[PDB]
């Protein structure tokens, strides 16, 4: 769930780390839009930790 104001021109993520609470590896994805701004996309989630 992510929008840019005209279009989406990059991606990308951040590293996965250990949800505390959780207990399961989780990152967040980031588009870049034309204009230079970043919006997050979405969490993924990975293995139990
Ligand atoms: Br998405
Ligand atoms: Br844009
Ligand atoms: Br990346
Ligand atoms: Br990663």
Do not use: F
């Given at each position: ?7 989406i ?6 590293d996965?780390?250990c949800?505390?609470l959780?207990k ?12 230079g701004?970043?919006?997050?996309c979405?969490t ?6």
């Amino acid at each position: 769930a992510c929008q840019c104001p005209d279009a989406i021109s990059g991606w990308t993520h951040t590293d996965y780390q250990c949800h505390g609470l959780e207990k399961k590896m989780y990152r967040h994805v980031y588009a870049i839009c034309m204009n230079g701004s970043q919006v997050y996309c979405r969490t993924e989630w990975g293995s139990s930790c």
